[PDB]
Amino acid sequence: SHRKFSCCRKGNLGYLPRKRCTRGRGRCKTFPPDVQGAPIHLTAFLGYKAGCTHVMRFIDHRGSNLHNRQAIDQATIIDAPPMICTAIIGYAKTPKGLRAVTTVWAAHIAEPAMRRFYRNYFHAEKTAFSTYMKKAADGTYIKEQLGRLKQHADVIRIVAHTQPALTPLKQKKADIMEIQVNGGANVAEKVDYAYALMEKPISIKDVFSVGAQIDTISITRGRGFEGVVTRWGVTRLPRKTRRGNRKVACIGAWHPANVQYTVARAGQMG
Amino acid sequence: MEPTLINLAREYNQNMMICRHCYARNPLRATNCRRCRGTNLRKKKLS
Amino acid sequence: IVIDCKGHILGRLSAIVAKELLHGHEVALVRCEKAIISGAFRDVKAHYLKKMHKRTNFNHLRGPFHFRAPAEIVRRTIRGMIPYKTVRGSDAMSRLRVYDGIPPCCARYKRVVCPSAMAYLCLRPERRRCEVGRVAHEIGWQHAADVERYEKRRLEECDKWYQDKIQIDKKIAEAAEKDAELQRINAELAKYGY
Amino acid sequence: SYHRFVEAGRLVYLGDGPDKGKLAVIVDILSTAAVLIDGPTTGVKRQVVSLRWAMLTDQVINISEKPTTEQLKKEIEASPAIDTFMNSVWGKKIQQQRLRAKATFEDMGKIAKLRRERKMAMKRIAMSIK
Amino acid sequence: MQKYIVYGRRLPSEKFPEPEVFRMTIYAPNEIVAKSRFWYHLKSLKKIKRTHGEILDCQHIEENGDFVKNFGVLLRYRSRVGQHNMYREVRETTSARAMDKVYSEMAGQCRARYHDIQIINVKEVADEDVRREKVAMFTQKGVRFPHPCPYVHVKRAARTARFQDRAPHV
Amino acid sequence: EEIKGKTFLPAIFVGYQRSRAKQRENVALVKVSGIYTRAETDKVLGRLIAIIHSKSGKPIFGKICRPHGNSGMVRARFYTNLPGQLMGHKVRVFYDNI
Amino acid sequence: PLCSSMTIKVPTDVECTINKRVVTVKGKKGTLVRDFSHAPLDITHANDTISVAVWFPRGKRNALPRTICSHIENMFKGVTYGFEYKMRLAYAHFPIAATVVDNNKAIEIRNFMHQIKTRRIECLPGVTIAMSTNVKDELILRGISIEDVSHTAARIHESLKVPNKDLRKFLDGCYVSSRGLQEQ
RNA sequence: UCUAAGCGCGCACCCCGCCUCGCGCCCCGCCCGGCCGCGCGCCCCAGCCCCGUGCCCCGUCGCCGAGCGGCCCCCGCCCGGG
RNA sequence: CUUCGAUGUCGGCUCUUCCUACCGUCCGCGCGCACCGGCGCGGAAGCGUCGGAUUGUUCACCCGUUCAAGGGAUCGUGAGCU
RNA sequence: CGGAACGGCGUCGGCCGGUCCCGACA
């Protein structure tokens, strides 16, 4: 037979599998289009959500009832402790797909970034970039490696670390992100721009301008094992029903003999 | 507009042959209709 | 046995290749985007997109897996002619390497082209021959341009090496005369004829 | 479709059938499928062969229209076409092929050892001029 | 396929104390088929069954193959529609060879087996008398055409285990 | 071992003589390199062949009997029947008499 | 059997070179290379006659000799005389107005049926677009290739497509009037 | 003559993108050590520019080195909060 | 023809997929298409096909509204319910 | 390409008719 009355599916199957994010933090994944003709610009920056607020605004939207009128909107402040670049990663465009062509680390890596490397800093032996510091320091090795990137790399990225001392949280260990460098006329200019930013602070003001629109990526708030009614949006069944009303009633037909992945099932929400 | 242009447009718009099946814009002296596999039925119309 | 896949019909070479695999020969196929599939492109794409419809309704992860890359398209075609389920079949699908473009790994390997499966001999002029590389891009492969960008550089590199090889071989000819003279006089024309 | 036409008098190397490796001359064309071929100086008796068996050779011999086996034999002798083909690269290989065909398992054993020594000598020479 | 001429007569009776000898030119695979066809034809055309008749001879005819001669076969094929008629024209060295070429085209073009076709007549046509374009095209004194199937020479790729260092040219 | 220098001709154990229903393990289908027709097999018929036991390291000897098909393939029998793990494994046809 | 021969004659001024199945025709108006590799044809430049011959002609291989010769003749005419397609805009109540731009390689059409939307069309490479200095309400397009001047004509013809209504009654658009083929 | 070659436009469909996951792999760090194998022209088929060969020995004596290319080897908890 | 040492039986609710023999939306094309609106085709299954009064209803019917196609899944869906 | 009446200026092959160098208003 047929559903009789037409009703849409509940939930986006695109957002399946609905599992707790195994990746530690929200990852950039894809980065903005390079363009190949703009002042060289970094494309991203990590932030810690601080809070939300009200902002009174004046609207200049021509053709809208709000034109020449005031409005109040929800704002979301994202705390932005200034990040520091610690390395430069170049990526060749290979037939298989973007694949790295070696990274050049900073001669001096800060303790917050080193804290990320270990599970317990106090009980660890601090053996990170120990022979690297000796291989560099003179810095001749760093330039030679950067030169290898200039010929073998087509997409340049800057590794950067947040300092969590200047943020109210207790993270103490830094968060590392590969921020892409885009817009320069050529790859040799891009790595030259990167060397100037190396081991020096980057601030949100430089990365993003007021009036631009940005895409915010993060792990959502976790609700734990949720019921189908909260997790997928289904109806709470009639209150005269035995064995519960907080459950999808029928999870499939006789055939297919197996429960389909489409059907809403109870799991982790958040 | 000018009558020469009206006739020029007619050549591009109402001077045609349409098969009864393909409903296609077949050529004027078309023995068969290409799209309809060659049914010989044909006609056209004007305002 | 590295066979340049260029110009071969997918099925015709796959039959020849499956036999050499099930007979304990290790075989690698390169430039598999340049392999041909007889049939107008419209039909080929249709038969490949009809393929990508057949997926398990209950969970599409246990469903028939369709791989967009043109190398994997061949690997699935050879797998059809190989009893992959048996150890004789699994160990033989292991001895097959499929590469889209000749890769750094198979750059210096000697390459042999199987004439029986080559398209110009196999199919009549006027059969709208398609290539897998064109078909692969439509069904989803995302790296057609990247293979083209890399093999342009590889081919340019081969041309520089070719001038050197010609000078190296002209030099080998002036070193023809040796006990090789005796060996050729004994075999190449005398009695054996080889 | 440019060079090597199936004109009458084309000398044809036979590539399949009862005669493979024997030259013959196209006395007459039957259809676009077959040809009548006679090779008096090679032992192919005037027979109807298929143009799939025949492989055309560059050399073409003038023959009388409707020649007859004896007349064909006389004309072949006067023409140098058999000889030109024999000293040509294809002819040299056909002559070599006859000896390669004349083989026994023991004869093959000697060639295999020689084809290992030629291979080793080639490696030595390539190294020596590296 | 083999060109047999058969001579047969009605069994001698008190009404026919000398029955009439009938000759036919049956092109057949073997003498056994040739004498079967002869009886089938006699039954319809002369009302003589084998059970009431005796074949007196079935002699094999051998024809020389010195030169290609055009040959014309008038036949009455039978397709699922019903019996029709058809004239064919084949350039071949010998009549039996031409008839073999005739039976193979009727198999491919008209899907009729040996027993479906009945041969009304076979003959030798002259270069002047050709009625069909295919025989006419080669009938002319000068005929040069590029090799029709140069690609067929891959019959060697079968044995070369298909591993040529370079891909062969035609 | 017994085989120290005999040049040998390459060969492959393609599988046992079989049908889709039954398998005669006694007969082993060998393909002799360079032998492409039933006609060429007569030169290689009755020769001694041997396969090297991969696990044991000691050769299993055999002889070549009648030819399997029109494609230069040959049927052979060995002193001990073949294991089946030796499929695709190379077989050596000795150029020398023993 | 049959070589399905068709023969065309090379003009004296223009030079034609055939290598493989590629055809380069060079002349005062310009040089065009039309690859005819799509089909099976044997071509001889000869003393002064291009011949396209298809040996063993099948049902559809019968068409190829004439077209390849006709296409080669259009190349010849283009590099000696040059081709022109005059298409006139016809406008009823609202006047269409097309402005030539991009150094005569582009047309910008506005006020088609008083539509806010404007249409920008780019001439294909080697063929240019111009307006008529005397008749007016007429676009004269001229280039060496006969296909590439017609292809631009068509691109401009369908860009002006009345959305629905009744096309027999509503006759506003750019319609090719004369393929003049004289000059550029 | 829209098609038989050739050619342009083109659907809320289709396929990819973005997005959700992701086996595995890559780079770097600490290290930076072992194991293996020896083998490169390109295009074109209605010019096919000289064709129709070659390899035919992975032990059967090849195992040097170098060069390319592979392959392996790494990398803690408990405990306390959230 | 299968099932009776038993496969719980109608309609709803709930939820999920599928089909096209397409109602609107999309693309062309024909009208006995001036406009508006209708009508007939070919491609098209992404999206929508709802709120209610009587009836166990499926249906039926009527009222409204962004005006509202038809069907498959053991006549989809009882250790899911009623 | 299970399939029917029914179509095809698809490509082959027939079977019977008329015009065709007297060249299918000049």
Automatic annotation (TrEMBL), chain B:
Domain of life of the source: Eukaryota
Its biological purpose: Component of the 60S subunit of the ribosome.
Quaternary structure (record): Part of the 60S ribosomal subunit.
Cysteine pairings via disulfide bonds: C19-C22, C19-C36, C22-C33, C22-C36, C33-C36
Binding site for Zn(2+): C19, C22, C33, C36
Lineage, broadest ranks: Eukaryota, Metamonada, Diplomonadida, Hexamitidae, Giardiinae
Protein name: 50S ribosomal protein L40e
Coiled-coil spans in chain: none
Section of the entire sequence shown: 78 to 124 of 127
Family: In the N-terminal section; belongs to the ubiquitin family.
TrEMBL record, chain C:
GO-annotated molecular function: mRNA binding; structural constituent of ribosome
Disulphide linkage map: C5-C32
Residue ranges of coiled coil: none
Gene3D superfamilies: Ribosomal protein L13
Keyword Aminoacyl-tRNA synthetase in record: no
Transmembrane segments: none
Pfam families the UniProt entry points to: Ribosomal_L13 (PF00572)
Keyword Acetylation: no
Alphabetically ordered keywords of this record: Ribonucleoprotein, Ribosomal protein
GO annotation terms (biological process): negative regulation of translation; translation
Database matches in InterPro entries: Ribosomal_uL13, Ribosomal_uL13_euk/arc, Ribosomal_uL13_sf
Any Gene Ontology CC annotation: ribosome
HAMAP family (alphabetical): Ribosomal_uL13 (MF_01366)
Family assignment from sequence similarity: Belongs to the universal ribosomal protein uL13 family.
Protein's name according to its UniProt entry: Ribosomal protein L13a
Organism expressing this protein natively: Giardia intestinalis (strain ATCC 50803 / WB clone C6)
Organism ancestry: Eukaryota, Metamonada, Diplomonadida, Hexamitidae, Giardiinae
UniProtKB/TrEMBL annotation, chain D:
A single Gene Ontology CC term: cytosolic large ribosomal subunit
Pfam families given in the database record: Ribosomal_L14e (PF01929)
Keywords tagged on the record: Ribonucleoprotein, Ribosomal protein
Any one GO MF annotation of this record: RNA binding
InterPro entries in the cross-refs: Rib_uL2_dom2 (IPR014722), Ribosomal_eL14 (IPR039660), Ribosomal_eL14_dom (IPR002784), Translation_prot_SH3-like_sf (IPR008991)
GO annotation, biological process: ribosomal large subunit biogenesis; translation
Keyword hit for Ribonucleoprotein: yes
Residue ranges crossing the lipid bilayer per the database entry: none
Family named by the database record: Belongs to the eukaryotic ribosomal protein eL14 family.
The name this protein goes by in its record: Ribosomal protein L14
UniProtKB/TrEMBL annotation, chain G:
GO BP: cytoplasmic translation
InterPro entries for the chain: Ribosomal_uL6-like, Ribosomal_uL6-like_a/b-dom_sf, Ribosomal_uL6_a/b-dom
Pfam families hit by this protein: Ribosomal_L6
Signal peptide: none
GO molecular function: rRNA binding; structural constituent of ribosome
GO cellular component, one term: cytosolic large ribosomal subunit
Protein origin, superkingdom: Eukaryota
Protein keywords: Ribonucleoprotein, Ribosomal protein, RNA-binding, rRNA-binding
Annotated family: Belongs to the universal ribosomal protein uL6 family.
Protein name: Ribosomal protein L6
Provenance organism: Giardia intestinalis (strain ATCC 50803 / WB clone C6) (Giardia lamblia)
